[model samples]
Every structure is written in C-alpha cells, then in structure tokens.
Target: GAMGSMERASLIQKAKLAEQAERYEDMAAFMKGAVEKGEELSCEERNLLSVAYKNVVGGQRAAWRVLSSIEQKSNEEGSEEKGPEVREYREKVETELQGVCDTVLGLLDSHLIKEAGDAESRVFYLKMKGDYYRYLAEVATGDDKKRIIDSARSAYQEAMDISKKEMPPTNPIRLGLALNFSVFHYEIANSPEEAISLAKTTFDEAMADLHTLSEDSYKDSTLIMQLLRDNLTLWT
Candidate 1:
C-alpha cells in the first residue's frame, strides 16, 4: 500500500525541521531514504536535500546526485522552458566542486562584486563565496592556505558590510550575517577578540528585539540570539 499523505507530510516536516536546526547530516539521511523509497517530494525539498548534502560533505558530488534526479524529473515533465535554465543551474552546482574554486572566484570577482541585486540575495552569494573559499582553505597548504583563507575573510567582511548598510539591525539576514562572520573570525582568522565583540553586539540587539516581539513571531530570532550567546560563552 502507498504511504498516507499525512505520513509523507510528517516526514517532510521533520526533514525541514532538521534543516532549520542545521543538522544537515540528519536531514540528508532522512531525505535520501525518502527518495530511495520512492516517496514524492517537491523540487524545493529536493534542493534542500542537495544543500544538506553539500554542507555535510563539504563537496558537490552528493549534491550533484540529487540534482541529477531533479534534472531527470524536469525532462520527463516535458516543459519546453527548460533549456538555458537547466544548464545554468547545473553549472552553478558544478562551480562549487573542489577544483572549481577559481571558477566561482572568477564570477564573484567579475560580476557579483558590481551586480545590483537585492541586499539579501547579494549577501547570500557573498556568503557562498566565503564558504567555498573556506572549504578550499581546509585542504590547502602553505601559500595556498593563506591565500584562500584571506579570500574567505574578504568575502565574509564584504557581506557583513553590505548587510550593515542595507539591512536593519533587527533584520534576520543581518543578524545571521553577523553571526556567521563572527564565527569565521573565530575559527579561521584566530581573532577571538573580534569575534566576541561582534557576537556580543549582535546578541545584545537580538535580545532587545526579542523582548518586544511576540514569541510566535520571533521564535527564530530567539533561537539565533541564544546560539550567539552560547558562542560567546564558548569563545570566552
């Protein structure tokens, strides 16, 4: 017998919850099982699984596997609107593979730097660049390590600066950018003082906003604030 809709919905909800908690490995495991068992999933859900795998393994091979399935489904749907779009999407995924760091960097340097996109989307791309460089730095040595780490720091800082200029203090994107940037400083730059300073500032603002917003409205913000505080404590 086929699985009930309620059961399928519950499983998807759990997978998304795991994603929200940043438990990518768990999310990937559940999603992989669902896909293997022939359970239906939306394209967005499939993309989330791919992202989860990318985060877990720090590579694009697992992500490409999921994306390949998506590509096959797209082909079967017979949508004529799938030429350049599909090609571009696959190219983006390929850009994140280990040896293609230079390809991503080239795009960032040439177009992304001056592209006039929305603040949120721009910030996201910048963080993606930082993440890619950080991944490269992990396996790099000597001059290569230093260069990649510096690139990561530059990308993170650019994102933070843009967030400060374009987003409000209470904006979740801004808060998230600050949190991630501080972690980059702490972990990659070996700058505990800078990391603690930024985290403390963001945490204080987040707590103040938490007091004014309804619990239901600010649940995510509250969680992020708690995490920021925890990070500060750990760093100190």
Candidate 2:
C-alpha cells in the first residue's frame, strides 16, 4: 500500500529533526521513507535530502578523523612532525581544504543578485576572504601568518559594518557572517581565552537562530553548522 501524505510528511519532519541533531543515520532512514512515499519533492527538498546523505554524512566523517588526529597530537608527539615536516603536512591539507571551500564560495559569490546590493555581496565576499585568510594564518610561516591574520581582521570588520544596518531577528546573513568570523577568532586568536570567548559567543548566537528556523531551513543549515563545528574542533 502507498504511504499517505500525512505519513510522508511525518517522516520528512523526523528526518529534518535527526539532521539537526547531527544524527545522519536517522536522517537517511527517514529520508528513505519520504522517498518511498512517492510524494513529489521540491528541488530544495530533494537537495536537502541528497546533501544530508552525501555531504553531511560522508563529509563530516572525514572531517572528524582529520580533526581528531590534530587534536590528539601532543606537542612533543609531533615534534619531529612539526618544524618542517608537520608544517608541510598541515599546509598541504589546508591548501586542499581551502580550495574546496573557495570553490563553494565562488559559486555563491557569482550568484549574488543586483537587487541584494553591495552590502549583501560584501558580507559574503568578505566573509569568504576572512575565512580563507584565517585558514592561511593557521598553517603559514610567522610573517605570512601575521599577514593573514591582519587580512582576516579587516574583512571581518567590513562584514560586521554591513551587519549593523540589518535589524535584530531578521539577519541570517549577518548572523552567519558573525558566527564564521567568531569561529576564526576563537580558533586562532592570540590566546586560548580569546578563542574560548569568541567560540562561546558564536555558538550562542547560532543556537538562537537555529531555534527560529523551520524544519526545512534547519535541515538545509546543516552544511554551515558542520563546517563551523568541524573547524572549531580541529585542534580540540
């Protein structure tokens, strides 16, 4: 017997909830049921389901391993791996990751509509540049790292400036940029205290917005959430 509309709707709702909780397996299961119901899906809905299975599941699994190894490494344990060897290794991986992230951002940037204005594009472009610079700061040499940090700070400030114009409770882009910048500061700030403060703020702000989004929006938001979470946890 074919699944009813209500049954399919329930399954999709559950799948979205599981996705939000980072329960990828449960999300996949519910999504499978939603598909089996043979209900027509919007492009966004199909994209969400596909992304939940492909990117959220596989991407996070890979990110976790990379992050875990970095976190678990003792200062002395990676002494030999550090100086030149570890630096090279980290640089190589960072380059690859940055390239992938840049591609995604590039696509988003290209699609920026004129109606959205420079403020919106500036927010996104600066955010992307800031994230890239932050990553560079993490893995570069002393002077290069300093340069990257300065660039990141400048770009983040620009994004923040644009954000000030948007009203509270109606600024997803503002909140997203702020969270991304905060994560960068938290992970690469001058000291651990700075990092922790920024991280806590980012997490708090994100969770506040998370509560307001519908199930569908929440499900779609996983890509950003996982990226932020993985980046913050990279050094544990």
Candidate 2 has its poorest 10 consecutive residues by lDDT at 107-116
lDDT of each: 0.68, 0.58
Candidate 2 Cα deviation (angstroms), residue 37: 38
**Highest lDDT model number:** 1
| lDDT (10s digit) by residue, model 2, range 46-134 | 54455555453345336644753664473544343433555455556555655544443343244421223556555655665676566
Best by TM-score: 1
Model 2 deviation from the true structure expressed as Cα RMSD, one decimal place:
10.9
